[PDB]
mmCIF file of C-alpha atoms in Angstrom:
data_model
loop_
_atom_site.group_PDB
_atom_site.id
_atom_site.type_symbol
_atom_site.label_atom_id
_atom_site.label_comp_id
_atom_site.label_asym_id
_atom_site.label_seq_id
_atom_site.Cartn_x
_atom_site.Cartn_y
_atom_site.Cartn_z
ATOM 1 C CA UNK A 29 167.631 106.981 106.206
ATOM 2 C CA UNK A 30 165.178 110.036 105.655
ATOM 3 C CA UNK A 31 167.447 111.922 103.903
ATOM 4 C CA UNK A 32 168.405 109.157 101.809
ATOM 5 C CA UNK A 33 164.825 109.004 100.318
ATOM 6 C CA UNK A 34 162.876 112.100 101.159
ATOM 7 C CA UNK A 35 164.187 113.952 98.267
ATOM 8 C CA UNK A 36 163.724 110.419 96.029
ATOM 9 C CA UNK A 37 166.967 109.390 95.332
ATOM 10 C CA UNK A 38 167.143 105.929 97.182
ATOM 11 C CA UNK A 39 163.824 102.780 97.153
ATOM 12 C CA UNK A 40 161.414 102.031 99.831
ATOM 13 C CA UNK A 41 159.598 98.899 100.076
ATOM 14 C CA UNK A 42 155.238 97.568 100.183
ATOM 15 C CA UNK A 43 153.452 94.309 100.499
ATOM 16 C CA UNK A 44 155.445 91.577 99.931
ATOM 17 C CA UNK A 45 158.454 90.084 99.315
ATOM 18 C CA UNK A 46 158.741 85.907 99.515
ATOM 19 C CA UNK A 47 163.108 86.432 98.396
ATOM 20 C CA UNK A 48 165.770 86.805 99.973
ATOM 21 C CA UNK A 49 168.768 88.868 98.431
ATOM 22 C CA UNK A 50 171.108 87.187 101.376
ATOM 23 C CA UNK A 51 168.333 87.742 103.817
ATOM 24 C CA UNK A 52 164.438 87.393 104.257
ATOM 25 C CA UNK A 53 162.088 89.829 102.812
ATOM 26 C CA UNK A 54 162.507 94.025 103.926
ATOM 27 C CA UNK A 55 158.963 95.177 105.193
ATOM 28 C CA UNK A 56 159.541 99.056 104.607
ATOM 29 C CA UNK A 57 163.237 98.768 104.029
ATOM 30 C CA UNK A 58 164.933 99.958 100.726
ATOM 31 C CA UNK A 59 167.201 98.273 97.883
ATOM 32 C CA UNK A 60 169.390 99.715 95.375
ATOM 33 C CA UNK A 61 167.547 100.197 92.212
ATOM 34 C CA UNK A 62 169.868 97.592 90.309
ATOM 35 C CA UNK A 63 169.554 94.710 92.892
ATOM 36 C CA UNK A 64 165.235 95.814 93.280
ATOM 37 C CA UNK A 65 165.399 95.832 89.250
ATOM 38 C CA UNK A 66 167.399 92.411 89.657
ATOM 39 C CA UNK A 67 164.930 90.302 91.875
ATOM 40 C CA UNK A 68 162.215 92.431 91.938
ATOM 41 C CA UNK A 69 160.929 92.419 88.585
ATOM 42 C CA UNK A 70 163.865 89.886 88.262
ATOM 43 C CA UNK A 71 167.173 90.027 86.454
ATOM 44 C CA UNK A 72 168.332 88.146 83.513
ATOM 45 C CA UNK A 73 172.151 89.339 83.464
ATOM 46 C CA UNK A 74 174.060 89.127 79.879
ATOM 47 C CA UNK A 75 177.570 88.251 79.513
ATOM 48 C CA UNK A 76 178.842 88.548 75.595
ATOM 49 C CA UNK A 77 181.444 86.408 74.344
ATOM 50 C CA UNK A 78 184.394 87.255 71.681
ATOM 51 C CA UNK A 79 184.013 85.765 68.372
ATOM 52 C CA UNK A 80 184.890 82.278 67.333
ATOM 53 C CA UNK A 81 185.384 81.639 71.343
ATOM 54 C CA UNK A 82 183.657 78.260 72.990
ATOM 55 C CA UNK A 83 181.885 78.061 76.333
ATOM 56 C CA UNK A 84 182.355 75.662 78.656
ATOM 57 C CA UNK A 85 178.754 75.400 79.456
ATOM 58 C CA UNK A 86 175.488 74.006 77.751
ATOM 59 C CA UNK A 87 172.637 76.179 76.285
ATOM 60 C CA UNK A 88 171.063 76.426 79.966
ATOM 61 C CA UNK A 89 173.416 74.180 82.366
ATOM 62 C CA UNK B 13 137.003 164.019 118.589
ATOM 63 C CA UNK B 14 137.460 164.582 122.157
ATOM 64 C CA UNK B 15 136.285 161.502 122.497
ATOM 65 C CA UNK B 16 137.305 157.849 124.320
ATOM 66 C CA UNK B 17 139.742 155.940 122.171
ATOM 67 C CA UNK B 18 138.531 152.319 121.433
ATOM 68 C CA UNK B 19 139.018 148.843 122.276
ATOM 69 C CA UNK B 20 142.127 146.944 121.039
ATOM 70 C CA UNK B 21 141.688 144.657 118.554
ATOM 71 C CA UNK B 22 143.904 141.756 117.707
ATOM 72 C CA UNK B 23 147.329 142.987 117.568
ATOM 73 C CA UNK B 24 148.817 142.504 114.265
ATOM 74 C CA UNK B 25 151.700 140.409 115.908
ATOM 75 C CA UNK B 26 148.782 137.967 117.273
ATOM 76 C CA UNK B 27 147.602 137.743 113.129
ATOM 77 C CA UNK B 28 150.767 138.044 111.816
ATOM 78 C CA UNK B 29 152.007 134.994 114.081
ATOM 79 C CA UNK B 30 148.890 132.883 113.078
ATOM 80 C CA UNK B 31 149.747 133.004 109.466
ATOM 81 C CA UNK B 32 153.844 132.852 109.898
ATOM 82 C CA UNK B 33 152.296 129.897 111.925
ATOM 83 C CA UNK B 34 149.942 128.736 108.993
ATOM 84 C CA UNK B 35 152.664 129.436 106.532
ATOM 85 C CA UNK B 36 153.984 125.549 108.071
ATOM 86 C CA UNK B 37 152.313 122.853 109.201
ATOM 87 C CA UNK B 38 151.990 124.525 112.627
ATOM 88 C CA UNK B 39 148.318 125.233 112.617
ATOM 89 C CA UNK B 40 147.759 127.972 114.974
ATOM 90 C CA UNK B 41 143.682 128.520 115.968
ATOM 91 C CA UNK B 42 142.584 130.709 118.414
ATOM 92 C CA UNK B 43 139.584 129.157 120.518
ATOM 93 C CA UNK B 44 135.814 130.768 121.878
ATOM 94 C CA UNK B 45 134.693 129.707 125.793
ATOM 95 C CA UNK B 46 133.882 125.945 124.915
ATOM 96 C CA UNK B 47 136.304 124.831 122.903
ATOM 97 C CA UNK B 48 135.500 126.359 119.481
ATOM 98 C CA UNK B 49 136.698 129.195 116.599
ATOM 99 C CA UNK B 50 136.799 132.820 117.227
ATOM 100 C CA UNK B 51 137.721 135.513 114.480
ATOM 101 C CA UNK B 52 140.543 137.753 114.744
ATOM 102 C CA UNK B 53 139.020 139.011 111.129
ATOM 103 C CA UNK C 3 155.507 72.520 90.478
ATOM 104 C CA UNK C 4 157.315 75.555 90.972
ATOM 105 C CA UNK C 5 159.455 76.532 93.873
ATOM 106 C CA UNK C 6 159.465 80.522 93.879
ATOM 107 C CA UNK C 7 157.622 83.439 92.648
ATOM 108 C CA UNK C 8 159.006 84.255 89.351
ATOM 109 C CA UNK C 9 158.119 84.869 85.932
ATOM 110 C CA UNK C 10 157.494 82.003 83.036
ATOM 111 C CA UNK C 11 159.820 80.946 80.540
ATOM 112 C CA UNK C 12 158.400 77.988 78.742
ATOM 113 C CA UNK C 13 161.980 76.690 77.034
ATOM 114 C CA UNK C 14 161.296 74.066 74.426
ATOM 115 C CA UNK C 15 164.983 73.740 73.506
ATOM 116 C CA UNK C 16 165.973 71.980 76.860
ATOM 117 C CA UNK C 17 162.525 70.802 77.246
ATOM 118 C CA UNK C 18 162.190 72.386 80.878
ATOM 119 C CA UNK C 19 160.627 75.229 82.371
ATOM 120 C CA UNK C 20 163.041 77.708 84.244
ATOM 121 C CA UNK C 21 160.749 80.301 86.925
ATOM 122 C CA UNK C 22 163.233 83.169 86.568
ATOM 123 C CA UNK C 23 162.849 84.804 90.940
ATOM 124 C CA UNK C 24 160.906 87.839 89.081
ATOM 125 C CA UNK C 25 157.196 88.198 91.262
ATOM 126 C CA UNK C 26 155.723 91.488 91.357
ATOM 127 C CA UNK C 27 156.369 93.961 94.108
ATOM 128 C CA UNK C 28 155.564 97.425 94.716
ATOM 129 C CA UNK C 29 157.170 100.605 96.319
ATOM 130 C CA UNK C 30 157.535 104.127 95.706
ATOM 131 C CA UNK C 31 159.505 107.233 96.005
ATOM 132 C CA UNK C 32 161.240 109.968 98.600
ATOM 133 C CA UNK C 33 158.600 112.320 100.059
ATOM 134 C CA UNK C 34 156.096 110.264 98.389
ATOM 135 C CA UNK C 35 157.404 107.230 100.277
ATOM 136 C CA UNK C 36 156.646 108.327 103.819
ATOM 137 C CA UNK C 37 153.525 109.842 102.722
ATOM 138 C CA UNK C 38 152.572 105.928 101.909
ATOM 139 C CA UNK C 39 154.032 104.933 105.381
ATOM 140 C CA UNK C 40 152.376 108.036 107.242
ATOM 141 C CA UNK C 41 148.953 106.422 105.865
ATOM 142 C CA UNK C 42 149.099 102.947 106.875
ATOM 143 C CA UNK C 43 150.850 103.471 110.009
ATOM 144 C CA UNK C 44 148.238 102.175 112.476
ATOM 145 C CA UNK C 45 148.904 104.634 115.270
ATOM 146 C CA UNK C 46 146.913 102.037 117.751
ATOM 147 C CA UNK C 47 148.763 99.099 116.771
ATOM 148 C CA UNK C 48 152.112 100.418 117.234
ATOM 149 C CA UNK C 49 150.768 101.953 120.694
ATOM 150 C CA UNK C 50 150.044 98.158 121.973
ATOM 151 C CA UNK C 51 153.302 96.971 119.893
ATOM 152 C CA UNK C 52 155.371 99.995 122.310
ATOM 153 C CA UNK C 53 153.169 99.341 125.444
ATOM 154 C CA UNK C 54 154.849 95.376 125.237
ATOM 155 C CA UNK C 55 158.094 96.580 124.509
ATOM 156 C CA UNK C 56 158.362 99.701 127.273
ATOM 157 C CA UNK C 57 157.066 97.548 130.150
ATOM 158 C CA UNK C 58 158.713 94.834 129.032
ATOM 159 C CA UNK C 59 162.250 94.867 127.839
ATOM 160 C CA UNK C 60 165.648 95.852 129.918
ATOM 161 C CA UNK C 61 166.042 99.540 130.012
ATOM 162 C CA UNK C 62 168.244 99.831 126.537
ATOM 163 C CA UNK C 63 165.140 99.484 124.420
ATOM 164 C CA UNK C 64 162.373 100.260 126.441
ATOM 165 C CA UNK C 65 163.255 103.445 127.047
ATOM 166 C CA UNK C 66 163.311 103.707 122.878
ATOM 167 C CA UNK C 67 160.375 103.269 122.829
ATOM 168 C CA UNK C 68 159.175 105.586 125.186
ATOM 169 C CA UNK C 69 160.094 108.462 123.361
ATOM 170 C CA UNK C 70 158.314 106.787 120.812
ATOM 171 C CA UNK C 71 155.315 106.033 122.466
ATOM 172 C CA UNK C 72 154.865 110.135 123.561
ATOM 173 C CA UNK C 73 154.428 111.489 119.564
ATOM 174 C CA UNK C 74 152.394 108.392 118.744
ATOM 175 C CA UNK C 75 150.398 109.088 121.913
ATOM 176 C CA UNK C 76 149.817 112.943 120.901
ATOM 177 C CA UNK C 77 148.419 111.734 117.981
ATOM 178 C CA UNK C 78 145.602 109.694 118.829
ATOM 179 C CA UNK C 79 145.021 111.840 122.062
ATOM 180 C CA UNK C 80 144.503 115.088 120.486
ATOM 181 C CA UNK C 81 142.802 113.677 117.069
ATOM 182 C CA UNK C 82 144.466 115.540 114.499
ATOM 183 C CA UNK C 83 146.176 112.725 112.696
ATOM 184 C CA UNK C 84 149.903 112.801 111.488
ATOM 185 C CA UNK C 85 149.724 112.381 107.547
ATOM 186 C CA UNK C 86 149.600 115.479 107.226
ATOM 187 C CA UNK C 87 153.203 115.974 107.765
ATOM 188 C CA UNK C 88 153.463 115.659 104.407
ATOM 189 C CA UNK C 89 153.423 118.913 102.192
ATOM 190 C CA UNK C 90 151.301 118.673 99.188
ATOM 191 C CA UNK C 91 149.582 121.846 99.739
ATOM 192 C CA UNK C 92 151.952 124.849 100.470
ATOM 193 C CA UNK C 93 149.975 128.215 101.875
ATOM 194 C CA UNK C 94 150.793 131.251 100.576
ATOM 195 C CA UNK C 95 151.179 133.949 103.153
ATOM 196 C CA UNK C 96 149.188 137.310 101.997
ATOM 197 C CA UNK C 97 150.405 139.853 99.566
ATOM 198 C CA UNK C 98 150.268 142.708 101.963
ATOM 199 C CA UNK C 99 152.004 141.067 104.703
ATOM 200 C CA UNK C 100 154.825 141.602 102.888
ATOM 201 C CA UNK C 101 156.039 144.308 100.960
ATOM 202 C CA UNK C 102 162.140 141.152 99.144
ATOM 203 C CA UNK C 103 163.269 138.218 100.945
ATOM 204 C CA UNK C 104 160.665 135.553 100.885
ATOM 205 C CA UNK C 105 159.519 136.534 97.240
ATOM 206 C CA UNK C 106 161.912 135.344 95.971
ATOM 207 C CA UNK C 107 161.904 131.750 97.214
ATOM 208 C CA UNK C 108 158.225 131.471 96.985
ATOM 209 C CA UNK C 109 159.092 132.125 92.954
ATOM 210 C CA UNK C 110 161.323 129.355 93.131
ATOM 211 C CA UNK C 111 159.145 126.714 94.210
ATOM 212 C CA UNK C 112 156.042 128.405 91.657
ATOM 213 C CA UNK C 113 158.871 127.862 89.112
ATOM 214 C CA UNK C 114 159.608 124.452 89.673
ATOM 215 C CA UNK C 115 156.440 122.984 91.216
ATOM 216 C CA UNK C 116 155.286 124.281 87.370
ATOM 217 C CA UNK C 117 158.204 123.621 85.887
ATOM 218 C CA UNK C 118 157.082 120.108 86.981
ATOM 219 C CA UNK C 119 153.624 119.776 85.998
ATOM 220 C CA UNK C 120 154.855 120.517 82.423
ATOM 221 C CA UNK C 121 157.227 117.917 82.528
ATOM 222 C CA UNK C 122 154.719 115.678 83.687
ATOM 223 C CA UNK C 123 151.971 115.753 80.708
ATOM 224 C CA UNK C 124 155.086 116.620 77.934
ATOM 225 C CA UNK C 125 157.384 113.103 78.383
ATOM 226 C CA UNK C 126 157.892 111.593 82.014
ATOM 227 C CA UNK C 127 161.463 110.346 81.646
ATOM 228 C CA UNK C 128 162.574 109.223 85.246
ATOM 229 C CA UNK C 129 165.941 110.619 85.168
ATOM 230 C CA UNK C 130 164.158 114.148 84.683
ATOM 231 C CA UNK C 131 160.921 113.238 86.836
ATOM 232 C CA UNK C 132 163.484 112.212 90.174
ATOM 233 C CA UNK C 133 166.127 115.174 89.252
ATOM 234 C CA UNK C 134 162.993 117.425 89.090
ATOM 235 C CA UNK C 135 161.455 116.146 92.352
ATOM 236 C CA UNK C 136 164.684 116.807 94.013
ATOM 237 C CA UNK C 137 164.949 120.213 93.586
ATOM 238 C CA UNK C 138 161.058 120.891 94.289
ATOM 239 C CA UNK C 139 161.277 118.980 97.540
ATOM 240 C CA UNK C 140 164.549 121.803 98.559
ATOM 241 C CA UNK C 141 162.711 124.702 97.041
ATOM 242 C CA UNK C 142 159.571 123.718 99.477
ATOM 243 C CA UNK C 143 162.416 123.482 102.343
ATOM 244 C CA UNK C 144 163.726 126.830 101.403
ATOM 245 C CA UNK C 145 160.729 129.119 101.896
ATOM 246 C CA UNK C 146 160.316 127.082 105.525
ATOM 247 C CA UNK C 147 163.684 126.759 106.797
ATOM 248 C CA UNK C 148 166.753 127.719 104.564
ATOM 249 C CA UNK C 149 170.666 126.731 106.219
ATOM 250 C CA UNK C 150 168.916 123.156 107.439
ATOM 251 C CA UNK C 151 170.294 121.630 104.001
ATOM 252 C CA UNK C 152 172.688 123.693 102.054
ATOM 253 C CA UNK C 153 171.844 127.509 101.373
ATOM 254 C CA UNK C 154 170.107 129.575 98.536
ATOM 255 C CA UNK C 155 171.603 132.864 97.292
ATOM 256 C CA UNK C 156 170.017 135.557 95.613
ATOM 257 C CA UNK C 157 172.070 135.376 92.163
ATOM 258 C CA UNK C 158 175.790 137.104 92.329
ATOM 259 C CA UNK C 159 175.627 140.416 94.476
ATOM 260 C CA UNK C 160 175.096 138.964 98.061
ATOM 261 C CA UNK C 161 176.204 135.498 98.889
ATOM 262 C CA UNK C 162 173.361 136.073 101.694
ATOM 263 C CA UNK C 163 171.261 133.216 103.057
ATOM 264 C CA UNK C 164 167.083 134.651 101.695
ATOM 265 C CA UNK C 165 165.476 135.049 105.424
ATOM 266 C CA UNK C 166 163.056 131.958 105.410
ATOM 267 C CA UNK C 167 159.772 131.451 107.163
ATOM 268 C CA UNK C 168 161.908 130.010 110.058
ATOM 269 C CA UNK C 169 164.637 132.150 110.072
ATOM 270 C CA UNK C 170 161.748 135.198 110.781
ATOM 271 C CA UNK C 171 160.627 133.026 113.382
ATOM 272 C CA UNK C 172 163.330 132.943 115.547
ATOM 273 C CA UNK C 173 166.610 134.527 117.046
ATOM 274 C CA UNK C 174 167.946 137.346 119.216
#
């Protein structure tokens, strides 16, 4: 684990964390920057659609 | 001089180890009679 | 009322109020990372936590924390407290000491630790800052102990490991 952040690569973790990415809240432990971008400072995820194409869900079903 | 050759100071491989002993974390002091300093310089 | 920490998005074209899971959290980065630990780490509390656990569980994790319990011991005992593990401050060993190996490397990390700096009031773009940090943090392993994590060569004409603080320490 050192090694994966002593030269700053990889995350490490602070205070508080109420959610649980499968699992309660890492004390100290470290995420990958996409899933600590994701829930952390949360993640709205885009998915773009091909032209003149219809969904088969509502505006926020 | 004909004279008597004086005392031996600190050998320079006692002050060259405290610094290549300063030079990391390693902090190497030398110590007087109750626990204190003493100067090699 | 809400359910989870999150962020506000007051939506008037469903007429409802999604919390996206967004709360605030904070952590930090590689050497700086333990540094934080290193601080916080109440020595005495984790003395008490290991005294409960050596005493008290079977022999696989007790003796765990023995081990543990020595450094943490050490510590506290002696007084000199372990933050300081952490390089921030690199000594310079004297000019006439020596008269080159260790040059060298000690240019590197000048280079880079001002290299940095630079790079620091210029733009901060994190690709760059990490990338940057990265090398610093190998430099300031070089001049101590090169060979522990890959090793530096003087330019083409020697593919020669530069004798490191550690490397004049020991050996035959």
């Amino acid at each position: 684990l050192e090694q994966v952040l002593y030269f700053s690569k990889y995350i490490v973790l602070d205070p508080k964390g109420a959610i649980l990415n499968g699992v309660p809240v890492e004390k100290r432990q470290l995420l990958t920057d996409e899933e600590y971008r994701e829930l952390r400072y949360g993640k709205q995820e885009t998915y773009p659609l091909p032209p003149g194409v219809d969904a088969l869900v509502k505006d926020g079903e | 001089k004909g004279e008597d050759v004086p005392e031996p100071s600190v050998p320079e491989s006692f002050r060259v180890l405290v610094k290549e002993l300063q030079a990391l974390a390693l902090d190497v002091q030398t110590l007087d009679e109750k626990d204190n300093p003493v100067d090699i310089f | 009322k809400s359910d989870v920490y999150g962020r506000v998005e007051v939506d008037l074209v469903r007429n409802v109020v999604r919390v996206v899971e967004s709360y605030d959290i904070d952590a930090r980065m590689g050497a700086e990372a333990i540094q934080q630990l290193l601080k916080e780490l109440d020595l005495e509390a984790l003395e008490k936590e290991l005294l409960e656990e050596m005493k008290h569980p079977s022999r696989a994790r007790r003796a765990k924390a023995r081990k543990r319990l020595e450094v943490v011991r050490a510590f506290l005992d002696s007084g000199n407290r372990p933050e300081w593990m952490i390089l921030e401050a690199v000594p310079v060993l004297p000019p006439d000491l020596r008269p080159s190996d260790l040059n060298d490397l000690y240019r590197r990390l000048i280079n880079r630790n001002n290299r940095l700096k630079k790079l620091l009031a210029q733009g901060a773009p994190e690709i760059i800052i990490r990338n940057e940090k990265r090398m610093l943090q190998e430099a300031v392993d070089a001049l101590l102990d090169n060979g522990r994590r890959g090793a530096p060569v003087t330019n083409p004409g020697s593919d020669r490991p530069l004798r490191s603080l550690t490397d004049i320490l020991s050996g035959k």
